[PDB]
Amino acid sequence: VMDVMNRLILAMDLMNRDDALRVTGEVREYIDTVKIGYPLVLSEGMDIIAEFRKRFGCRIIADFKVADIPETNEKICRATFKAGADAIIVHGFPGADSVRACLNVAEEMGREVFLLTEMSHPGAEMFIQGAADEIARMGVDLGVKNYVGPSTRPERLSRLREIIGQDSFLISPGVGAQGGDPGETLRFADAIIAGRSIYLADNPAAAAAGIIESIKDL
């Protein structure tokens, strides 16, 4: 599994190139794994992945929550890995064939797929939560090794960890701004994801250091 420094992943959702680069560089000594999503990619282009690789020694997780039909999913994954992303996050709710399409591309291109099971926001309770356990089980059956689960629902994150087993890799967003606790989340997740609590802080470096200090014993 990827070795995430300090078990902390930066969710870089700033939409300005200059700000995104500044903040990421300021926390570089604390984080070596950055999650880049569509807010930044659709604002600055896929070349932003290339720029991050060039400027920082950071792994890149493309949080694109791939959720299309198999044929389109394959194209999205190909373009994303071609750009330099180490891994891509895919939704499981669209079904097994859609996930398999991503796994196949990742396999042939030498990259990784992260399967998003349950989400952290309130709306996730409407449809996603009820299908989450099965989505996770489907991932295990498909050979998925990396997963994404909600920090905002400890009980659910715990169950997801059980389903995927201790050997699987699990990252969890919702820490900070959404209310998730770093320490509690790390009881089940291999790494936590933090966005606003870091990039909107007056001193992003101090914010990252603070999070790490609170989980030093872990």
Add this chain to the structure above:
Amino acid sequence: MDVMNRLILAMDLMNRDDALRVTGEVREYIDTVKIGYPLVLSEGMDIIAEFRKRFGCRIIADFKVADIPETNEKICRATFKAGADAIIVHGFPGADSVRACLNVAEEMGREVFLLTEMSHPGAEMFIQGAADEIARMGVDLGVKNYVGPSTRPERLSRLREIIGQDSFLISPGVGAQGGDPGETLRFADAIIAGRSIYLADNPAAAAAGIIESIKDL
């Protein structure tokens, strides 16, 4: 919206030159183009403005938005800043995530299309069972534009029943995936066609053929 010939081109080619050439070859038949991540992630968001500059076409950004509210807002803003007239959003993530998109769309003078049930086999696993409820949610939220599957006419018909005749419904899965143009238009206002057009030996003749088959519609 008034979609020429009730036919929307799904431009999923991943090369700027080919995407532009093919779209130009069928411009006389279509005035509405659906641009998704295959093209955008390969050529950049600037491709949207280029389409509006070269063609007199509406642009539907098929990004199947499926994040938390906060992120959905940012995605919609970036998408509309690029010139997209509408954006397609997943309903599965819940009402708050859809509302986030509706807010930005209202702010920038754009439309939100709610994707209920999908057209591929995998849609039967989780999406299909929640589709009717997702459509009802759209109705409760005031959504007026929807996306339903050409591959399952009975399901597409049910979606139409839920949203009513006033709502606008577009449907993918025609051609390559097996959907029939004419049958799909019994329920959808417009059909979406990708590969059956852009991968055909003669894209223009392909588009012309589809239109000829639905001439009476």
